[PDB]
Structure 1
Amino acid sequence: TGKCGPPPPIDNGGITSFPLSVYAPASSVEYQCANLYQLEGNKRITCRNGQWSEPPKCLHPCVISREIMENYNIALRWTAKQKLYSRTGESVEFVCKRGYRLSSRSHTLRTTCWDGKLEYPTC
């Protein structure tokens, strides 16, 4: 009493240490997210009473691809980069390509990536 087994797994993440088969109460471990993922929550879980405290979460990024910037008739306002990988919490801003104009359906060109979902404007 009251020792924990290995720390729980989390989608798109890992621990920074080598898993022990058993932990002493009050020991910590720490999680890292994959490349473009945003860790949400405390990064460090703590063992108590046989239980691990709540783990974090790895927020998905959004791939802004040439292909989709085509379908929407857009392009990145600030870089020449034809593709972009954006982490949750990151804002991207577009322009129309010469020739099109902003569809009635869209009112803004500046979007933010939220957990893998990013609202594209239409041109």
Structure 2
Amino acid sequence: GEKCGPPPPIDNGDITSFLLSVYAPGSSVEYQCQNLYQLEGNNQITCRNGQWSEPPKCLDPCVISQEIMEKYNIKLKWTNQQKLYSRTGDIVEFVCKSGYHPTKSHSFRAMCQNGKLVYPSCEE
């Protein structure tokens, strides 16, 4: 028919209004992501001829790894400020641990991307 059923769920997010079982044609609902998750795509969906348009995605934060930093002889540039969780799109800055020198492996200015963070490394 013309009316829609409940809007689809999204991982780590939800709609901003109270869930109904049935929606009028032309109805719109919007999504919000969980604390630390980042909305990607149009946050709004619309009911047209009994079907919802495509919902957005929620991009994962990165967890800063003490073990990976220890492995690669690096440390945070700002140890006093760094939160355990980094939102997608945030930049994490590293430096060498004392008595270590940078390798040409990866940038020391790393961007968090959907749970993935590329760590630089230092040697000797």
TM-score, length-scaled by structure 1:
0.90
Contact 2:12 2:58 in 1 (8 A): yes
State the Cα deviation string for residues 10-36 of structure 1 (Å, max 9, x = none): 111111111100000111111111111
Moved more, 5-14 or 85-94: 85-94
Contact 2:60 2:88 in 1 (8 A): yes
Residue 99 of structure 1 pairs with residue 99 of structure 2: yes
Instruction: Give the structure 2 partner of residue 113 of structure 1.
Output: 112
Instruction: Give the structure 1 partner of residue 12 of structure 2.
Output: 12
Q: CA RMSD in A?
A: 1.6
Contact 2:12 2:33 in 1 (8 A): yes
Residue 23 of structure 1 pairs with residue 19 of structure 2: no
Residue 2 of structure 1 pairs with residue 2 of structure 2: yes
Contact 2:106 2:118 in 1 (8 A): no
- After TM superposition, give the deviation of residue 79 of structure 1 in Å: 4.2
Q: Give the residue type in structure 2 aligned to 1:87.
A: R
CA distance in 2, matches of 1:80, 1:45: 41
Call closer, same or farther: CA 1:21–1:51 in 2, change over 3 Å: same
Q: Give the residue type in structure 1 aligned to 2:58.
A: C
CA distance in 1, matches of 2:28, 2:83: 39
Residue 47 of structure 1 pairs with residue 47 of structure 2: yes
- Count matched residues: 122
* Sequence identity percentage: 75
Q: Give the residue type in structure 1 aligned to 2:21.
A: S
TM-score, length-scaled by structure 2:
0.89
Aligned-partner SS, 1:45: strand
Aligned-partner SS, 1:19: coil
Instruction: Give the structure 2 partner of residue 62 of structure 1.
Output: 62
Contact 1:65 1:82 in 2 (8 A): no
Task: Name structure 2 gaps, 5 residues minimum.
Answer: none
Q: Give the residue type in structure 1 aligned to 2:48.
A: R
